[PDB]
């Protein structure tokens, strides 16, 4: 159920945490490309991207983005003036699509000012869903340039899923959705003198997993405290779930069709 996404970020007065422009791409959870207002170059962020992709690709998209850098600066400057905004403000953009296991494809295009939804593109009606009066005046200017709306529609509808398919055939990790979890259960002392059972799963891929604790077969969601799925750095993930031990408990885990139950001594 793989996906390809590219974002753009623009910031007004960044006193440290600059630069004013950043653009990063991802195939699923993997960074693939990078660009920023400092290093005015598109670069690979994966090894299978360095190989496979001809230097023509990088050169063409470096020129393109250098221009998208200038547009972003203009588009943002304009926004703060239609509001009565002064200081530092954030402008974000996102494209990309998904390839659902059935064969059906999706695709989105969104914009945000100060982390709030500003403009949403509906590719099936070549329309923009404007949040306020400012967005509506920008939306109006965009809707008159029809060939752009068609370029965008077609990029999602065709070019995007084609590119994702190419990136996935440079996958021996991306396409590979089998790296099984390594589950272990260890008693902790959460509070003195309270003991808690901890189920810890690590080293799995892809990051979609499910784990729970069960008292005598009954699952008790209100007594369970779940942990988030976290990145490890080595390309695999970790997660946990805990239960408060009172004065028969078992741990359950599902991952890429594999089902496992662990029982405490």
């Amino acid at each position: 159920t793989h996906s390809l996404r590219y974002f753009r970020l623009g910031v007004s007065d960044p006193i440290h945490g600059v630069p004013e422009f950043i653009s990063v791409g991802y195939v699923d959870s993997h960074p693939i490309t990078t660009y920023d207002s400092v290093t005015r170059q598109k670069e690979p962020r994966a090894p299978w991207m360095a190989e496979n992709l001809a230097p023509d690709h990088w050169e063409r998209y470096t020129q393109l983005l250098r221009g998208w850098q200038q547009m972003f600066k203009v588009e943002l400057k304009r926004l703060q003036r239609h509001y009565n905004h002064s200081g530092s403000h954030t402008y974000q953009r996102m494209i990309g699509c998904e390839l659902l296991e059935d064969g059906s494809t999706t695709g989105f295009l969104q914009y945000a000012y100060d982390g709030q939804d500003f403009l949403i593109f509906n590719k099936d009606t070549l329309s923009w869903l404007a949040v306020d009066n400012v967005a509506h005046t920008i939306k109006q200017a965009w809707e008159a340039n029809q060939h752009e709306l068609l370029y965008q529609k077609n990029w999602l509808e065709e070019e995007c899923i084609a590119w994702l398919k190419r990136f996935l055939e440079y996958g021996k990790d991306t396409l590979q959705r089998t790296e099984p979890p390594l589950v272990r259960v260890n008693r902790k002392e959460t509070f003195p003198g309270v003991t808690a059972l901890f189920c810890k799963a690590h080293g799995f891929y892809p990051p979609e997993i499910y784990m729970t604790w069960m008292k005598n077969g009954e699952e008790i969601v209100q007594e369970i405290d779940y942990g988030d799925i976290l990145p490890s750095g080595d390309g695999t993930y970790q997660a946990w779930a805990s239960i408060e031990l009172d004065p028969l408990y078992s741990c359950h885990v599902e991952h890429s069709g594999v089902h496992m139950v662990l029982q405490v001594p």
Binding site: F7, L9, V11, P14, I15, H16, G17, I22, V24, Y26, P31, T34, R45, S88, T90, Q92, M94, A112, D114, G115, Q116, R184, K200, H202, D228, L230, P231, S232, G233, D234, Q238
Partner: protein, 97 residues
């Protein structure tokens, strides 16, 4: 619309005294993008700290990972200090073993 980050300190591999590892500090779901993150060892700041590719979720709220190679000693006390626009005083999150 500003969001306070969610700080989480943990190790790449399960903890073992004397063996090498990595201390991760996963900062997520905050707005705006300016975040100062430092890894600590017995109060002192760790000089060599590498960090991940900044990304933003669909809620436009950014997330980063900061990590450092380390050999967990028996007595060593590790933590993560974080300051944002939403924080008046930096939050320090101790590593749990």
């Amino acid at each position: 619309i500003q969001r306070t980050p969610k700080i989480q300190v943990y190790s790449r591999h399960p903890a073992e005294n004397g063996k090498s590892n990595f201390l991760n500090c996963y900062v997520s779901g905050f707005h705006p993008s300016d975040i100062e993150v430092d890894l600590l060892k017995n109060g002192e700041r760790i000089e060599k700290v590498e960090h991940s590719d900044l990304s933003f979720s669909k809620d436009w709220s950014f997330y980063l990972l900061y990590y450092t190679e380390f050999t967990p000693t028996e007595k060593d006390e590790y933590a993560c200090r974080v300051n944002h626009v939403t924080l008046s005083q930096p939050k320090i999150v101790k590593w749990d073993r």
